[PDB]
Amino acid sequence: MIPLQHGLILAAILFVLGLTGLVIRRNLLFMLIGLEIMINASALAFVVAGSYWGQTDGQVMYILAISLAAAEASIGLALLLQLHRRRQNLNIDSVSEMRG
Amino acid sequence: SPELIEILLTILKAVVILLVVVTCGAFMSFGERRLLGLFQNRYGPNRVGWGGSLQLVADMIKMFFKEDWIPKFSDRVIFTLAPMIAFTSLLLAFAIVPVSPGWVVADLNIGILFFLMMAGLAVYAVLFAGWSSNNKYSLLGAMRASAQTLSYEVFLGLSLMGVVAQAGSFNMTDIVNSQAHVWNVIPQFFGFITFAIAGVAVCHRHPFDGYHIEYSGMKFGLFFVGEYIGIVTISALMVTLFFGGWQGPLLPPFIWFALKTAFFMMMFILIRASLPRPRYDQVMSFGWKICLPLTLINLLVTAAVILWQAQ
Amino acid sequence: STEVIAHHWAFAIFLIVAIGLCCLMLVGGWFLGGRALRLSAKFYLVAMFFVIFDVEALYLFAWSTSIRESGWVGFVEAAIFIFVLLAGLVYLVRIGALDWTP
Amino acid sequence: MTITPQNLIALLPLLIVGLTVVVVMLSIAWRRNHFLNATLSVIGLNAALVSLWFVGQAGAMDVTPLMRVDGFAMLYTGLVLLASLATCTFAYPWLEGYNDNKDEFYLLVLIAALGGILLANANHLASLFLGIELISLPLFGLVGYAFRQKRSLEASIKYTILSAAASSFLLFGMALVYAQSGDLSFVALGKNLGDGMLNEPLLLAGFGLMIVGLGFKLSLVPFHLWTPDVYQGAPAPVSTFLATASKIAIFGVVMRLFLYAPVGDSEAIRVVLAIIAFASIIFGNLMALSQTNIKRLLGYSSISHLGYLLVALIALQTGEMSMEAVGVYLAGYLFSSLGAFGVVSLMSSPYRGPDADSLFSYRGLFWHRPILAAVMTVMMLSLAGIPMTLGFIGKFYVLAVGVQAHLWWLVGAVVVGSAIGLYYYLRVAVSLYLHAPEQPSNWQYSAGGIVVLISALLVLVLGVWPQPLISIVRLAMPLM
Amino acid sequence: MEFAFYICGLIAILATLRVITHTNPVHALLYLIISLLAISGVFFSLGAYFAGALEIIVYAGAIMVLFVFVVMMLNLSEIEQERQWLKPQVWIGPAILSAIMLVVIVYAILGVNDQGIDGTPISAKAVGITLFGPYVLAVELASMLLLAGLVVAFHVGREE
Amino acid sequence: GHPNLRRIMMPQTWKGHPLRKDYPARATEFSPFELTKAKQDLEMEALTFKPEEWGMKRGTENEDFMFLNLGPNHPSAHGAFRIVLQLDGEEIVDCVPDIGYHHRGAEKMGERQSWHSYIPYTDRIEYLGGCVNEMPYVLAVEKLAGITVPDRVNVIRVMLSELFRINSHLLYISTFIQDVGAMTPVFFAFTDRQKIYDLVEAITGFRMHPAWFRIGGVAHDLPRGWDRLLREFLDWMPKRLASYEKAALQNTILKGRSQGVAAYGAKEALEWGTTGAGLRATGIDFDVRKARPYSGYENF
Numbered sequence A: 001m002i003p004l005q006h007g008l009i010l011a012a013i014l015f016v017l018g019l020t021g022l023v024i025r026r027n028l029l030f031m032l033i034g035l036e037i038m039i040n041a042s043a044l045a046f047v048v049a050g051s052y053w054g055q056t057d058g059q060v061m062y063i064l065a066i067s068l069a070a071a072e073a074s075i076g077l078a079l080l081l082q083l084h085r086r087r088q089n090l091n092i093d094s095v096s097e098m099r100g
Numbered sequence B: 001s002p003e004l005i006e007i008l009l010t011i012l013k014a015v016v017i018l019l020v021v022v023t024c025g026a027f028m029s030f031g032e033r034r035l036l037g038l039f040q041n042r043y044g045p046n047r048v049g050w051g052g053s054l055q056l057v058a059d060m061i062k063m064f065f066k067e068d069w070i071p072k073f074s075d076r077v078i079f080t081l082a083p084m085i086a087f088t089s090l091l092l093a094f095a096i097v098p099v100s101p102g103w104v105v106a107d108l109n110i111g112i113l114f115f116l117m118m119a120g121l122a123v124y125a126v127l128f129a130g131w132s133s134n135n136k137y138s139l140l141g142a143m144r145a146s147a148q149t150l151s152y153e154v155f156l157g158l159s160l161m162g163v164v165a166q167a168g169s170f171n172m173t174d175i176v177n178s179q180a181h182v183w184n185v186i187p188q189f190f191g192f193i194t195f196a197i198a199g200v201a202v203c204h205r206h207p208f209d210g211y212h213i214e215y216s217g218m219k220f221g222l223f224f225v226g227e228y229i230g231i232v233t234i235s236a237l238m239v240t241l242f243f244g245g246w247q248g249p250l251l252p253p254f255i256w257f258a259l260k261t262a263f264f265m266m267m268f269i270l271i272r273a274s275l276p277r278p279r280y281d282q283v284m285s286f287g288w289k290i291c292l293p294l295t296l297i298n299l300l301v302t303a304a305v306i307l308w309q310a311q
Numbered sequence C: 001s002t003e004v005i006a007h008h009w010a011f012a013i014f015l016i017v018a019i020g021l022c023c024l025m026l027v028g029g030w031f032l033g034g035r036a037l038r039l040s041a042k043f044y045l046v047a048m049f050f051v052i053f054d055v056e057a058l059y060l061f062a063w064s065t066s067i068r069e070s071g072w073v074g075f076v077e078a079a080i081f082i083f084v085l086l087a088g089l090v091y092l093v094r095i096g097a098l099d100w101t102p
Numbered sequence D: 001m002t003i004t005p006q007n008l009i010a011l012l013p014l015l016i017v018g019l020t021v022v023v024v025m026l027s028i029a030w031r032r033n034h035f036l037n038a039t040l041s042v043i044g045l046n047a048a049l050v051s052l053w054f055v056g057q058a059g060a061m062d063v064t065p066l067m068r069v070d071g072f073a074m075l076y077t078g079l080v081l082l083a084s085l086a087t088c089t090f091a092y093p094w095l096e097g098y099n100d101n102k103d104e105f106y107l108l109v110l111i112a113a114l115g116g117i118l119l120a121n122a123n124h125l126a127s128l129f130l131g132i133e134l135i136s137l138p139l140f141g142l143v144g145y146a147f148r149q150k151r152s153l154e155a156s157i158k159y160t161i162l163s164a165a166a167s168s169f170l171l172f173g174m175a176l177v178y179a180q181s182g183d184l185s186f187v188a189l190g191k192n193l194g195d196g197m198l199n200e201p202l203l204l205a206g207f208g209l210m211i212v213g214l215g216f217k218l219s220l221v222p223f224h225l226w227t228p229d230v231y232q233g234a235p236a237p238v239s240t241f242l243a244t245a246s247k248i249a250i251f252g253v254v255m256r257l258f259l260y261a262p263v264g265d266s267e268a269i270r271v272v273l274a275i276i277a278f279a280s281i282i283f284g285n286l287m288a289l290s291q292t293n294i295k296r297l298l299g300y301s302s303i304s305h306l307g308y309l310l311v312a313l314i315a316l317q318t319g320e321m322s323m324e325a326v327g328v329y330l331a332g333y334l335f336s337s338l339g340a341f342g343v344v345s346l347m348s349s350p351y352r353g354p355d356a357d358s359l360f361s362y363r364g365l366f367w368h369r370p371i372l373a374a375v376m377t378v379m380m381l382s383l384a385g386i387p388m389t390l391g392f393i394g395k396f397y398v399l400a401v402g403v404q405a406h407l408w409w410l411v412g413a414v415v416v417g418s419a420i421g422l423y424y425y426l427r428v429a430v431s432l433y434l435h436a437p438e439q440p441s442n443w444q445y446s447a448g449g450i451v452v453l454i455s456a457l458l459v460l461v462l463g464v465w466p467q468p469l470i471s472i473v474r475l476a477m478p479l480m
Numbered sequence E: 001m002e003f004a005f006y007i008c009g010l011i012a013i014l015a016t017l018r019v020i021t022h023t024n025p026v027h028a029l030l031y032l033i034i035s036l037l038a039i040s041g042v043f044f045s046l047g048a049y050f051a052g053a054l055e056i057i058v059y060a061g062a063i064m065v066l067f068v069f070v071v072m073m074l075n076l077s078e079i080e081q082e083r084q085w086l087k088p089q090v091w092i093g094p095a096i097l098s099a100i101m102l103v104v105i106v107y108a109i110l111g112v113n114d115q116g117i118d119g120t121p122i123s124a125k126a127v128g129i130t131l132f133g134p135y136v137l138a139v140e141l142a143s144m145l146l147l148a149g150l151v152v153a154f155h156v157g158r159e160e
Numbered sequence F: 001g002h003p004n005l006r007r008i009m010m011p012q013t014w015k016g017h018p019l020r021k022d023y024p025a026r027a028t029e030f031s032p033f034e035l036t037k038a039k040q041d042l043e044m045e046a047l048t049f050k051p052e053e054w055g056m057k058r059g060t061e062n063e064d065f066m067f068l069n070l071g072p073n074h075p076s077a078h079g080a081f082r083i084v085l086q087l088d089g090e091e092i093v094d095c096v097p098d099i100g101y102h103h104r105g106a107e108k109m110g111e112r113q114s115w116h117s118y119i120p121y122t123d124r125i126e127y128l129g130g131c132v133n134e135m136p137y138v139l140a141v142e143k144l145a146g147i148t149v150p151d152r153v154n155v156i157r158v159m160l161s162e163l164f165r166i167n168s169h170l171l172y173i174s175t176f177i178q179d180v181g182a183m184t185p186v187f188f189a190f191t192d193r194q195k196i197y198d199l200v201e202a203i204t205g206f207r208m209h210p211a212w213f214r215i216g217g218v219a220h221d222l223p224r225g226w227d228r229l230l231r232e233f234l235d236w237m238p239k240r241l242a243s244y245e246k247a248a249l250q251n252t253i254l255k256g257r258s259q260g261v262a263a264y265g266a267k268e269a270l271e272w273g274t275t276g277a278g279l280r281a282t283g284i285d286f287d288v289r290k291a292r293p294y295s296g297y298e299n300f
């Protein structure tokens, strides 16, 4: 009864909103938050696509997606902790020394 | 219509289960006081009412009419939000337990998975209470307690996975029906002890117990009644998962369920009254180095035994 | 079927009445009565260990419900999975990452 | 499907590298020894490289709904393993001066090589995703291995955030493609579309998002801005690995994706990739003009050479020698990048703390290090397409492939970008021999010098006689 | 089935747009947790029971707890006192390109065949059967990916 | 040459020196304004703490040396006191005890009471001791008066001192066990303390501070039937003491909490003046009851 187009529209909307959250925020924590929103939205897209066809492939790729999301959260938060330890701030344009 | 009659009867049974478990948690706190008195060679509260049974109503009235105090420089929403988490998470964790054939709230196909979601959501109560108190002492205490309950939550589902593998399904009706001949405590004894330790630790019970020195009035009552609701929840879960559930030879099944649950609650009381408290790092070492490999080896041995019998 | 929709209604009423009672007694508690440092990285370490091992746990959750139909080859794959997981755990323990005290 | 023991023989390098990861991890957990862990890692990589012979003796077969193994996959597995071995060899003298733990580097190199092998044998969108992630995450660790240094932590943060964004883009694109098609296999993308209905909007948009992710992973314009900063800030062996192995494996899985899928017959994707390749060649050659830092120059070189590779990619459906040209160019580019970044890593080692400058100052290198300067100028000539070098043979192959399919705009782009490359490569090569006032002692530094020496001699020999490389690339043939 | 799907999708979208615009990190993480609960409800409405189980168990129950732990570790200055992501001259560009991407993706989505999702429950048994059948190397190398993330995060996140 | 010569019994803003003979002993006028001033001092002390006047160095110079205050409120029988801890994670880098929150001026009161009426003040020096606290003062006054007490006085005073020693040791063991985490032994040991208090009430007429020793003897005689209560207590004790050992003092969690924690050798005990169980745990057999005997302890 629920159309497939509605599910992909919702997933696309959540993904692009996560893209705004990644771009417009200078704080690295909100950048990681937006990254997690986008990967979770794409995992929702895979689940919708798998539930339309009646196959577990969408759920398997969802499991791979959340594994990537967890490990990326670990690495990004470790890097954020190192940045806060060695710079005492979370400004992302403060880490801009290499150019040209 | 008979369909609407059946719907109303199921709703009535569900709300009866809800009020029964809430009243059982509150009277289990009263039984905490009475049984601590019994274990410590005294009486406990036995003056307010016939045998002390009206001490609970007076205590709840006192916490109702206590002056509520949200701290001035706190975060109001998070500070009030932690107690409904601590109550509702363990209540809905109890919501999946079939107390009797036909007296079940929801035959969810996930079941113990749903208990895992609620146990995962339960840590936000401690974290939110630590942060929202605007107190660095409570913040440090809640960081330590949340690290404790994470290190002991990491093997909760892995302890339950032996029962899940033996049942072959995530539904609790199948779990309590697969214990018809032999109860799951006999094959899954290592899973049983690891699940008991994890369930004690995620309920922040002794000896795994500050981040409550800023709550007062009815918020403290919410935290404590939610903790006892979690005690009843874990006891009923281990009854349904390791000790046959409602199944029993002679007595009616609800009587067997109540007797086993009461036995496990009095085991909670005895565990608090008997054992002392280990140190923080020793608890960390026991939760990481010992319990998690034990659950992994138990799951491997359970799978090997299951595939061995089905040649 | 009538049974499944009846139990869905019962679960919905269970959730609604639980939330309503809890917030209601919050309202009763608020309504009555008259008025008058730097942490360490070990917390992050154990939390990230918890997250990684919970994803390993979710894989074992998916495995454990379907051992009978997966057969012995599923047991072999999960044995490799669990051995890799235990090798990682031994690695974390041995280098003093999981030791809370320095 | 099920897994047979013969399929386990076809799984040999994957299992060998995974078991080497396990063994190196347990050796690290036993006792922290730099030499023992490095020796175990290179022994396992060599074991996978020599087990490729047993894989080829087994044959070509479809080991999983995920994986397919053929000689094409063995070729890219060998390239990735050679890049990883060179990375370890260059990384040991850099790691002698590291005050913190030196042992996690080889574990991360091993896991990234494992991801490269999975991407080499990939025949599924799940395998593509997992190989890309298994390449990226150890590179997140490796780029910021010297996290106390400012530039390394800078490059680590930039690479981690940008590659997480590209992972989200690629995974959403695979979600859209799977929603349109219904099966996640490579050969089952647009199969149900027939009689001019191949250009499906959902499938095209999904594949465009995959193009965005893979173009980040291949430093293609306009997803190229990360390349010079991450290349410069990372340690020089990490820059070597990120220039060679990641690019080779991701371009190989992109080759397999655009070969097997019927989506690659679409003219819209061909035009989009033509625009991307044209802009990549022109931009990656033009922004390397005024570069005085060698790492950023090699990053723009990587952008331009992946543009040349994309130009060779575009004629896959029209031509027939596209994959052979891609393999020859990938071998030559691998050897050239290995030699150049190896010279940079040797003359930038040992790691003298995070508080000291890591600037190269290659001017006057011949007057105290003649062999390293000779190897470096040979490989600067190799990257320019100048003859008696293997890069010239690769550029000749790319130009022949472009001429065969009448892709004349790409041919003119290759010529113009080659001229700009001549300018800046020859500027670096001459500056190696000028005069400068300012200007080892172990067998591992000598081993790295030996590695770059054999790389330079291989480039020269296969430039003056490229027939054995052509024969062994034509021997590696996938399944049409 | 559809009713819960629509309400949970609306709640997820609203919580996401509250996340991307808020300033308090703990409030942002709480709104993100609410969004993950809504997305889990979307999963349960469509029949993917295991996906919703891992949505609350793992993403809402582990990853958000890790973000919460980091936020309380930092004691989170220089963000709240300017609030430059609300003035239009900063966010109107990314919002416009964002909306352009959204209309492009929606236009691509709307031109596909649709038979409707039946909501048939694909339980955890089928996911486990196919996860250890045609997806063996996916499980093994995903375990190695988690291992790599563990090693990287341990190496970076020390204090010395 | 003293490193940090600051006041330890009185607050730092205290004019005069109390133990001088030209200082008034009785309480001065109370003022709530001074109470508000010291409240303000406490409030800005917790916010603007300066780890320099206390003799500590490295005032969070490592960017992780957090600062904690243990007291001054203390939910235990020891009493109110402050420790300011400098912490690296969970490690205690340095700590400065802040005492003086229980100063009753007992010596200045000794300059103000007679030799007879000062005995109750000698009781409250260590309120878990009672007659054990009364004993050295009355022995010193008997030295000043040239009094040699008879044997029955010595045996009576030894009896009461040993009873109060058992009372104090029971309270100490129960409070230590409660500090580890077990709860029941404090209830059981306080029941035993009630048995002791029954006997002491029969003997003297009070529980905690009997004020029963006198210069040259004791206040009254032993009542007719004290031997029955002493026999009942001596029959009641040892089974319960073995039960306490088995229930809590042999628990391996208590052993893990207590063994090897805050250990020092004989040199640290000698150089700091630590006496009692802390000195005899180092192997230095120095008990005053055996080395320099008093009050007829040789006969036992």
Ligand SMILES: CCCCCCCCCCCCCCCCCC(=O)OC[C@H](COP(=O)(O)OCCN)OC(=O)CCCCCCCCCCCCCCCCC
Pocket: D406, D408, D409, D411, D412, D415, D416
């Ligand atoms: C900066 C230097 C580089 C400049 C850019 C790169 C070169 C651009 C060449 C543009 C060629 C435009 C061709 C336009 C028609 C294409 C379609 C067509 O009908 O092609 C005819 C034919 C293919 O059809 P076929 O069946 O083979 O016909 C028999 C032909 N004997 O086609 C063929 O058989 C092949 C046609 C080949 C044409 C010659 C290509 C190379 C010419 C020399 C280099 C370019 C000119 C000199 C440099 C310019 C100034 C710098």
Ligand SMILES: CCCCCCCCCCCCCCCCCC(=O)OC[C@H](COP(=O)(O)OCCN)OC(=O)CCCCCCCCCCCCCCCCC
Pocket: D415, D416, D419, D420, D423
């Ligand atoms: C008759 C028409 C038909 C035939 C056409 C034949 C085309 C191929 C043959 C002609 C090629 C022309 C190349 C012109 C530039 C030659 C190189 C040169 O002059 O280099 C030196 C110059 C630096 O010298 P200086 O003036 O001191 O600059 C200070 C900067 N430090 O260096 C620089 O300024 C930087 C050099 C960058 C790289 C070289 C420029 C490449 C431009 C595109 C090449 C292809 C052109 C194709 C045809 C275009 C139209 C003729």
Ligand SMILES: CCCCCCCCCCCCCCCCCC(=O)OC[C@H](COP(=O)(O)OCCN)OC(=O)CCCCCCCCCCCCCCCCC
Pocket: B196, B197, B200, B207, B234, B235, B238, B264, B265, B267, B268, B271, B278, B279, B282, B283, B285, B286, F252, F253, F255, F256, F257, F259, F260
């Ligand atoms: C609903 C029903 C549930 C009711 C509750 C039932 C279950 C209760 C489970 C309680 C679990 C408590 C776990 C405590 C773990 C402590 C681990 C630890 O490290 O303890 C510290 C102590 C010494 O550590 P170590 O490092 O050796 O010290 C050397 C340095 N001085 O180390 C030791 O002393 C080593 C031994 C530690 C404890 C071993 C396991 C004891 C488990 C509790 C007793 C259960 C008895 C049966 C309960 C009823 C069963 C039906």
Ligand SMILES: CCCCCCCCCCCCCCCCCCCC
Pocket: D373, D374, D377, D378, D381, D388, D433
């Ligand atoms: C094309 C392949 C490589 C050919 C040889 C390139 C050069 C390699 C190094 C050999 C020695 C060069 C010596 C240069 C001496 C310059 C002296 C200048 C004096 C003013």
